[model samples]
Target: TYTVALTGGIGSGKSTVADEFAHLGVTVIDADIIARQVVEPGTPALLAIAERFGPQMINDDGSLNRRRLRERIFAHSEDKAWLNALLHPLIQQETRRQMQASTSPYLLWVVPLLVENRLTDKADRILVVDVPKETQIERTIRRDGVSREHAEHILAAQATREQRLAAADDVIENMGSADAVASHVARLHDKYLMLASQAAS
Candidate 1:
């Protein structure tokens, strides 16, 4: 299937961009959403997470204690690596599953770590939603209620700013107003549909 891998650093407004695509009736396969689904209460991914991180990471309600797990991984790079090792494959498998089921002319695969995870080859094209570093830090701090240092740490853990830009086949500068971003998405939608039509012919 023709695919666009949409990616950006933390607080780069990737989700907002995806929303615009969705509004245009495009199918959006989000890795972050699939990641959560793969570890839902009874899944093997959840079982593995419990085994590796212990029961403390699982709440009494049987859901993963996401906040606690986030803190643990942030505090220790090894733990983060370990969790990624277990979850990345599961998430990728499920991501493919959802993509295959989609019937859109072209689908958008939203993967925040498309570069860092080295999965750029999975897409026919890459779209990066970009914003300034200070904008990223400010948005993240406000959205996640995280300290500036914590927000910076998350950004640092992702692909370098230059790296993401270098990986892009197309980019939507997200520093402007929401209407401007929506207009960008509208144009890209037309372009993607034309590309998909040409591919089909």
Candidate 2:
């Protein structure tokens, strides 16, 4: 399957572009969605998470206490890795299944930390949705209702701007208006269509 990974740091508009692609009939699989699916009440992954994070991480209804878990994860890298260990394999399995089931010429996987998580090796290409550091910081604070301190920390936890640029096979500079973004994505979509045609020949 033709799989492309869409990624960026916090508030970088990865979700926006991925949504547009989905609306245009591209197969889009969000890693965040997959993560939530695996950890839903009583799944094996959820059971593993409960074992690692203890009963306190589960709600009375047997669902995950997302707020509590997020606190543990964002506060500690080890905790984040522990959560990743529990969730990644199950997410990958589902992602693979979805990719195999897709009829679209390309499979777009949106991952928030594709580089920071060291996760794009499986993708045929990487598309990074980018914005300036200041934009990222301000947007993160505004969007997540977090203070500047934690927002900056969240940015620091991701790959640096230069690092993302290095990883990008293609990029969407997302600091502009919706019309500007649509123009850029339109050009890129045309390029990918030609690429698909060439592969078919």
For all predicted structures, in order, the TM-scores are 0.75, 0.75
Candidate 2 C-alpha lDDT tens digits along 1-201: 667789888888988888878876788998788878888888887787778778898999999999988887888768877777767788889988888888988778887778887887988779899999999889888888999999888878778989998999998998668988987877777777677777777
Q: How many backbone clashes does candidate 1 have?
A: 0
Against the unseen true structure, what C-alpha lDDT does each candidate score? 0.88, 0.84
Q: Show the colliding residue pairs in model 1.
A: none
The C-alpha stretches of model 1 lying farther than 4 A from their native spots are: 41-63, 68-93
lDDT of 2: 0.84
Q: Which of the numbered candidates is closest to the native, going by highest lDDT?
A: 1
Clashes of each: 0, 0
* Model 2 bad stretches (over 4 Å): 40-64, 70-89, 117-121
